[PDB]
Design a binder for this molecule. Structure first.
Ligand SMILES: [Zn+2]
Lengths: 78, 97, 64, 103, 95, 91, 105, 80
DNA sequence: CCTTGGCGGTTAAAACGCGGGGGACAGCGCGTACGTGCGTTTAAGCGGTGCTAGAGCTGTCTACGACCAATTGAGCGGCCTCGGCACCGGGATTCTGAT
DNA sequence: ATCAGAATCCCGGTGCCGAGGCCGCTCAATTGGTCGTAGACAGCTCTAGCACCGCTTAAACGCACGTACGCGCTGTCCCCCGCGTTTTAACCGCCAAGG
């Protein structure tokens, strides 16, 4: 489930962040905060698609939901 | 023989500041996202480009939050991260009350 | 194992016939109708006895 | 075209159309889209000029988006502008806290 | 076939002006299109607030100027205002 | 240039009917109401332009209230709005 | 009932809101149910937050709501606090945050 | 002139106490002054720009309200 | 003899493992910056008072803008080419630690 | 320092593929012509922003002085790095017997 997040993945996240030395409970804490993040994002994304009356969430709606959380991301037609 | 610790990590920091390719690979991330949305609604075929968008935004988000957490720990007269550091950084940004 | 079946049903929206695909996931009791034309999707619960005519019937009642 | 008659490069009337369909006001003046188009033109000129220097750095001919993110993160006022902005295939500053460098 | 929009050819020409010997990737061209979108949207929203805090519904170039130097930081903004103002003169001096 | 003062008085008498209020409390309340109205309305305008719908009905308002307020507030607000739609539609 | 407010049984002026939408440059046309719907949402939000206002003002034996009451009632809520995260009230202050490392033990 | 030095140490103390800060170091006060100054720089720049387009030589409360809403540090209370 | 299940094979990131070494944590002891008071000095605050830019507010005429038929070629959808990078082995070099 | 040797950099090489040229369309920019009121502007009026000062007083400043958290140091003990060893997610090729 949430345990599909591997330890070296969050380690690579530290590496692109540039972080050297790693503790223990970091892993489960990371999975939790990532979960709540995706929860709010995909909730309002599916809200957009609910108004769309269509069965597939658009990439557009993902982009606009990111704008709605003030998390504006370019690149994919937004 | 055995190398002395800390070195390989920083060397791969210098390596991993180069390619902006996605760190979490696709299928398990996709399963996690699907298992999440399902909790909000059913029968929602995801555009794959939207999945890549979610993946990009999530990874950059977590990297930046790691940067602030790392600088918190550097301020904390230490080198290793702690979960309380993540709590401090989040308490500054204001996700949780 | 999932069952991906083509049917000869008409989509209730785009009206293209022989363009509704039914995906029946019995491991989780979730049936999925898909339109190969206009791209709409409809989900409904299925049992072990259900067939593409069972969820397509539930789709007719979900509209009306 | 008014853009050529303004001696510029962005299409005026497309912008004039989009100002109408944006519910941006009730009426739309004459040369306001010219001014806005020129603003856009100098902005993208400055941005992609720094991007061209970024390609000069790596000795690359085709612009990769990493060049774009780097040139955003180098200049001051541009990075303060696009603070809440991220880009797919972005990456970050190659940055090392030297207090974590070994001795 | 529905006709979709891009700004690719315009900024493409501008890139060819400022760097004749330079290629570009397609995704980055889309990124720049999104860039123009975002800047335009923030400007236009400031224009609508200019309207409602001025109780007027006409848009002239003066509002665009004050919008740009509200949004953008100083030195960059003043250079851009200079470019736009000289373009206003060169256009409206002729037809 | 109207404020919403007696509207607040009637809501207040419908909830805590033995309660006074200061002037600047009312001012902050009307500041609040205007902010909320502007945020919802602009988000609905985003719904229109992101969806190419040349007008706005109540369904857009429902999904925008979903987009702004979180869960419990959102569900109770949807309930109150649909109940008002019902009683106004009946007569 | 002549007035639409009496036809809605509510307390806000709807045609006010419809003119606000018209004098908003919001859409080009505005339907009939959306302004009623939004006004009902507004009325619910007022009553909901004024509940916490009433209890928070009643905490101090004072008939009148002060701004400090409003800030207290917001910060003691969860949904309203995450609502008003970027938001500051005049004459507000903040909560009593006495850390446990500070009391004389 | 020198009203930046009009910031008093006991005022910084009072702000720390309502801020809940117990122990105060001595190298804090001018840093505080500089941050406060840069804050107010950006604020009043934007407010005066809003009044520049207003074509009125006096800035209102409403102006400062609108400008701080533009920064996203948005404050209620005085209408706007 | 031609189908739906029902098990079978690369490989590569992924989970153990130990050992230890270097980094995290309690103590130690000082010490020197800093709370606290107390008296001394100060400037802020409040209440009047002149008091005037100048905003706040009101007729008016216009030109620029809203809007409508031709037109038309630029902007756009499709096709097609080549040299620009993506990786690969060579080989050279530079960190890194044991020495 | 200092050598051996891992780790990485960096140089032809080729390949392949998409960026970019290119080319024939058609629909919105244009061009031109016709109402119209929004606003640029002139001007009226009274408010309020400003400046100033006298009186009151509470608030800041300087210092006297102890003192106690901040900090450098110490020892210590432990538990992540890392390299090794399987090992299983992930992903293509065969037996069931029922139809
Ligand atoms: Zn269909």
């Amino acid at each position: 489930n949430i345990q599909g997040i591997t330890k070296p993945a969050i380690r690579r996240l530290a590496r692109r962040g540039g972080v050297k030395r790693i503790s223990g409970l970091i892993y489960e804490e990371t999975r939790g905060v990532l979960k709540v993040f995706l929860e709010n994002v995909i909730r309002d994304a599916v809200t957009y698609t609910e108004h769309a009356k269509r069965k597939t969430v658009t990439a557009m709606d993902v982009v606009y939901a990111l704008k709605r959380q003030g998390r504006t991301l370019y690149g994919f037609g937004g | 023989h055995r190398y002395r610790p800390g070195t390989v990590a920083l060397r791969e920091i210098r390596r991993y500041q180069k390619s902006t390719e996605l760190l979490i690979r696709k299928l398990p991330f996709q399963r996690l996202v699907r298992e999440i949305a399902q909790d909000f609604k059913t029968d929602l075929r995801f555009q794959s480009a939207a999945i890549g968008a979610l993946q990009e935004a999530s990874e950059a988000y977590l990297v930046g939050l790691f940067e602030d957490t790392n600088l918190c720990a550097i301020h904390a007269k230490r080198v290793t991260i702690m979960p309380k550091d993540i709590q401090l950084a989040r308490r500054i940004r204001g996700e949780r009350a | 194992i999932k069952q991906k079946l083509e049917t000869q049903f008409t989509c209730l929206f785009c009206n293209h016939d022989n363009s509704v695909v039914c995906t029946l996931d019995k491991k989780n009791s979730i049936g999925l109708l898909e339109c190969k034309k206009c791209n709409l999707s409809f989900q409904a619960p299925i049992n072990s006895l259900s067939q593409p005519i069972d969820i397509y019937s539930d789709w007719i009642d979900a509209c009306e | 075209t008014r853009s050529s008659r303004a001696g510029l490069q962005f299409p005026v009337g497309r912008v004039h159309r989009l100002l109408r369909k944006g519910n941006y006001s009730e009426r739309v003046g004459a040369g306001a889209p010219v001014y806005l188009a020129a603003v856009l033109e100098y902005l993208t000129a400055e941005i992609l000029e720094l991007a061209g220097n970024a390609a000069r750095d790596n000795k690359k001919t085709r612009i990769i988006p990493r060049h774009l993110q780097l040139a955003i993160r180098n200049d001051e006022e541009l990075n303060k502008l696009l603070g809440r902005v991220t880009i797919a295939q972005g990456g970050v500053l190659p940055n090392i806290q030297a207090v974590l460098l070994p001795k | 076939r529905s006709r979709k929009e891009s700004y690719s050819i315009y900024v493409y020409k501008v890139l060819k002006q400022v760097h004749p010997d330079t290629g570009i990737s397609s995704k980055a061209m889309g990124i720049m299109n999104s860039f123009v979108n975002d800047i335009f949207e923030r400007i236009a929203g400031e224009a609508s607030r200019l309207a409602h805090y001025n109780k007027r519904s006409t848009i002239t170039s003066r509002e665009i100027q004050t919008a740009v130097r509200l949004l953008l930081p100083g030195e960059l903004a003043k250079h851009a205002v200079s470019e736009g103002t000289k373009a206003v003169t060169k256009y409206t001096s002729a037809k």
